[PDB]
Assembly symmetry: C2
Homo-oligomer: 36 residues x 2
């Protein structure tokens, strides 16, 4: 659902950043409902 | 370039989250070079 994605940190490795990217993808998909 | 994207905050509005999404898109595009 509209789960607020957790931010690992600034020094987070690119893999976890990919994770955050996908988690933001899901979150944004939900909250924006593709209105951007 | 590989500019480390700035994190606005947890309560950041979805627009700025879109911004961070695109900034992460650029950053990840660079650093991963599409290897994910």
């Amino acid at each position: 659902g509209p789960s607020q994605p957790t931010y690992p940190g600034d020094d987070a490795p690119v893999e976890d950043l990919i994770r955050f990217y996908d988690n933001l993808q899901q979150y944004l998909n939900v909250v924006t409902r593709h209105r951007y």
